[PDB]
Amino acid sequence: SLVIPEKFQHILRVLNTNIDGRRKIAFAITAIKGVGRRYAHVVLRKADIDLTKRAGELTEDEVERVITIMQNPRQYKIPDWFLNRQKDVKDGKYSQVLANGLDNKLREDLERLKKIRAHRGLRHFWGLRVRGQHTKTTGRRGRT
Template sequence: MARIAGVNIPTNKRVEIALRYIHGIGPAKAAEICQKVGIPAERRVNQLSDAEILQIRETIDRDYVVEGDLRREVAVNIKRLMDMGCYRGLRHRRGLPVRGQRTHTNARTRKGPAKPIAGKKQPGKK
């Protein structure tokens, strides 16, 4: 099992797909890394040599912000917004959607499960 950027990537998948298991690498960056290192798209991780895995690891370390560093950077950015007290920071602080989505209905992912309100009648009951 190949370990890149602190993540065990699956061995039986294509390299381009397996690289996406690393936080911060999506389809475009995975293809870009494969092209830089010179690995064909249909190659599987278990067919890679140790030298190729090392090349991939060095390319990612040198050119991309991934995993722990990326998570830390995002957390610092959110904390900065919250400390500043701007609108986006307040939405983060209250656990509500940040990017203008409606909250009258939906937004359950951010708000959590619905809390019942005392005295509110359920539709369809008499």
Template sequence: MVRLVGVDLPANKNIEVGLTYIYGIGPASSKEILAKAGLDPFLKVRDLTDADVVAIRDAMKAFLLEGDLRREINNSIKRLVEIGAYRGSRHRKGLPCRGQRTKTNGRTRRGKRKTVGLGKPKEEKT
């Protein structure tokens, strides 16, 4: 098992797929890193040599990954909230900030439905 940027890559997967387990690397970034390192994308993670791992690490230095990327995203959101931008207010309220409708959809951001109502009518004493 190879460990890169604090993430254990699964030994039985191709290196192209294994790199996508790292936050900030998707399929396209994975192909780009492997092209820079000069490695075959279909090579298994368990078959990597130490020289291959060093080449991958060098190629990954151009990317923001894991904790640094998360910190960058959180700082951007905090900045939007602090300057009072519309997108910042949407983040604060937990609503979509890219113009989607929210009357009927948007359940991913808004969460599970909360039923609003009176419930059973109470009987009055006579």
């Protein structure tokens, strides 16, 4: 399969994001902000896809199989502790949160922390370190 056949695509378009076709698929679908180096491997093992195959080398019949497992992992036997959003503060729903949904959920966590005037929300507003860090000496680029 080292010959370049038909159906090679240099840039893929899943979850309204690009994919480098040069990469192995197990690191190529990490380009979706929401899917990382290891959630890529668990999705590409729940579907029978050989990991030495490249993103451009894949055909259309299996890229939809990849992103449907991305969209709903609990329907495809992925356990609950891979997910970046379980026990949500609004619907209590276990899900994996993806490309623009990740910015949406991060922003709603931020503003839901802002509205109650929590300390972490106020430090996120002012731009300081929110996890209790010593801001006296380091972090010289978030400030000035």
